[PDB]
Design a binder for these strands. Structure first.
Ligand SMILES: [Mg+2]
Ligand SMILES: [Mg+2]
Ligand SMILES: [Mg+2]
Lengths: 290, 128, 95, 51, 54
RNA sequence: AUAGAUGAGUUUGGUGAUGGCUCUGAUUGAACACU
């Protein structure tokens, strides 16, 4: 039963960015506006616009009520500590001066002096912001059906959900048929090779195959759902990327959920096609759903 | 107030606010059945103008209230069993209730297309 | 580059000292909008008092306020005042 | 006999000015106040000593 | 190749005054400096006195 | 349990206050209408 919300799934007029590799979706992603118009809109009109844009991609197949409580105000992050710094300094120099360290001359004086002041001691890679706003939809990255789509085992989040519901996935060597299963750090999910080749392979064309009847490497086998010899789907390279909280092994179509997505200074691990301005309004919406 | 004045019980519950539909709020009921004692017309107050179709209903609890009849045209009259819900007619004084259109004797608006669930109108089924 | 088609940013270009292209990169927003009225010998005179903010998003914010009989003119007055009244705001870790 | 005078700027003649401003305003989506400001901005007045 | 720049359709300026509704793409130009006053003309009232001298 | 604290409409010729009302959030051993 097709609901009213899925009619214009890849509308070229509305241009919604969906979690799939469809060619109509590639055009909507490439030609997306550099910045949505939020000049004269009110605070509600901005949060609703950001909520509609983001929810068109993140957890598209999950009800609004289920995600409303799946949303978490806890945005995890990490910091990089260089052993070379911690071995030479105990952090006292960071509390010099009046508690915040010594003062450096303003920028309009440094370059004036031909001699640059000695490098200030500090852990390398500091004074760079962390994109917390970009982690609004991190909880969705823990579902089994989503992790399968992020491992490049399926062409869409809905096709990966069918692999689970149809007993084609195996977590920790045990059959798992719940797409809402929340992976734990260390879980190893494995999909059937036959479903991955069809999901990511090219469509089976009879007209072109009809000409190839008789006229390492592989051969032809018309007794398989995908076109032989197996070749990658068209436009699959535009969506080819594996996040760092997964360790995929394509030889067996298996991956390990190493950890949860975290935000690092200057980087986020949640695949989202939206800017911090939109992810900041979506986060503000789900604080009180208004 | 001082700690002594509070210890003696200066803090008391604020005076109650009257409900929109006291006949229903008093007993926690969402709706009540009643018989129409009179079906007539009420006149709005200063700003608005027109004739509001109202009904004097005798609730099953014994109270006699005045309910507003939503929609265009009705079927009830004297000695008619109808279901009453909360909500008031803002411009009508004393009309603090509404009648349900898909009620026992009150029928839904026949030539209704939009918001049929508000007026107890079955779907035309013209397609089937 | 023909960006200023009404010469409204000409005086602001002297006070602040940044090109019109850099002025258009600021984050402006009309926050408050009141419809005030003054009783005069000639009847009521309703004005549009507005408040506008301007900032870089990196530690600068300015508040402007102006009124006028036209709602459009008041928004431009407040915008020019907001861009010239910008001040550095101290931030802890820029957050 | 015709004596046609070519004007370098449309602001040097009132007839040509009200004609242009009228054609601009004839459109439904024309911003009245904005169009008047663009015309006045095109008008250059010479420097003067008020005293 | 020499006639290419002649048939190239020019996009009107974002904030344009003359080509805001012009649908004849042949007349659309850059519009830069087309309204600058080069101090080479007087008012219509002056031409009446100049023609009187002629 | 260290993230958890938020507003909006509405009195006046207008402005700032005072002070209610309503909406925004969550829910029910619910009922009714359309399904
Ligand atoms: Mg009232
Ligand atoms: Mg309709
Ligand atoms: Mg008074």
């Amino acid at each position: 039963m097709k609901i009213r919300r899925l009619f214009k799934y890849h509308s070229l007029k509305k241009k919604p960015i969906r979690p799939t590799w469809n060619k109509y979706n590639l055009y909507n992603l490439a030609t997306a506006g550099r910045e949505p118009r939020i000049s004269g809109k009110t605070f509600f009109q901005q949060k609703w616009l950001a909520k509609s844009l983001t929810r068109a991609y993140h957890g598209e197949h999950i009800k609004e009520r289920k995600w409303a409580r799946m949303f978490s105000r806890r945005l995890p992050a990490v910091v990089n500590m260089d052993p070379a710094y911690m071995a030479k300094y105990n952090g006292s120099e960071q509390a010099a001066g009046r508690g915040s360290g010594l003062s450096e001359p303003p920028a309009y004086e440094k370059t004036a002096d031909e001699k640059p002041a000695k490098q200030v001691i500090a852990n390398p890679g500091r004074k760079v912001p962390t994109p917390y706003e970009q982690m609004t939809f991190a909880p969705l990255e823990r579902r089994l059906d989503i992790a399968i789509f992020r491992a490049l085992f399926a062409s869409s989040a809905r096709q990966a959900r069918q692999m689970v519901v149809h007993g084609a996935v195996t977590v920790n060597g045990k059959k798992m048929k719940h797409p809402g299963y929340l992976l734990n750090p260390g879980d190893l999910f494995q999909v059937d090779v036959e479903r991955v080749l069809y999901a990511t392979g090219a469509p089976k064309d009879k007209k072109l195959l009809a000409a190839a009847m008789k006229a390492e490497d592989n051969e032809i086998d018309p007794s398989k759902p995908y076109m032989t010899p197996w070749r990658p789907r068209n436009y699959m390279s535009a969506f080819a990327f594996i996040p760092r909280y997964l360790e995929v092994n394509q030889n067996i179509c298996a991956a390990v959920y190493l950890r949860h997505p975290v935000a690092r200074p200057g980087e986020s691990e949640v695949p989202s096609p939206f800017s911090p301005t939109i992810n900041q309004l979506a986060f503000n919406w789900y604080l009180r759903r208004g | 107030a001082t700690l002594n004045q509070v210890m003696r019980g200066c803090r008391k519950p604020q005076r109650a606010r009257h409900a929109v539909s006291p006949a229903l709020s008093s007993i926690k009921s969402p709706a009540l059945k009643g018989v129409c004692v009179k079906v007539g017309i009420t006149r709005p107050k200063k700003p608005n103008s027109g004739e509001r179709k109202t009904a004097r209903v005798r609730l099953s609890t014994g109270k006699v209230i005045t309910a507003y009849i939503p929609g265009e045209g009705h079927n009830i009259s004297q000695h008619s069993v109808v279901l009453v819900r909360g909500g008031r007619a803002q411009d009508c004084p004393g009309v603090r209730y509404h009648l349900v259109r898909g009620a026992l004797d009150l029928a839904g608006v026949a030539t209704r297309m939009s918001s049929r669930s508000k007026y107890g109108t079955k779907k035309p089924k013209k397609a089937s | 580059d023909g960006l200023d088609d009404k010469g409204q940013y000409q005086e602001l270009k002297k006070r602040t000292g940044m090109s019109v292209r850099q002025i258009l990169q600021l984050k402006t927003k009309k926050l408050v909008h009141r419809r005030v009225v003054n009783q005069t010998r000639l009847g009521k005179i309703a004005s549009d008092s507005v408040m506008v903010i301007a900032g870089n998003g990196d530690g600068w914010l300015g508040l402007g306020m102006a009124k006028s009989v036209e709602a459009s003119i008041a928004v431009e007055k407040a915008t020019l005042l907001a861009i010239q009244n910008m001040q550095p705001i101290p931030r802890y870790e820029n957050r | 006999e015709f004596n046609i005078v070519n004007m370098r700027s449309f602001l040097l003649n009132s007839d040509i000015l009200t004609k242009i401003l009228a054609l601009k305003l004839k459109n439904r989506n024309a911003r009245v106040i904005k169009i008047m400001d663009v015309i006045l901005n095109k008008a250059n007045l010479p420097k003067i000593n008020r005293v | 190749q020499a006639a290419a720049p002649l048939r190239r359709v020019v996009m009107p300026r974002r904030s344009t005054f003359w080509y805001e509704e012009e649908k004849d793409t042949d007349l659309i130009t850059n519009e830069d400096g087309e309204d600058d006053f080069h101090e080479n003309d007087i008012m219509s009232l002056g031409h009446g006195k100049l023609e009187e001298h002629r």
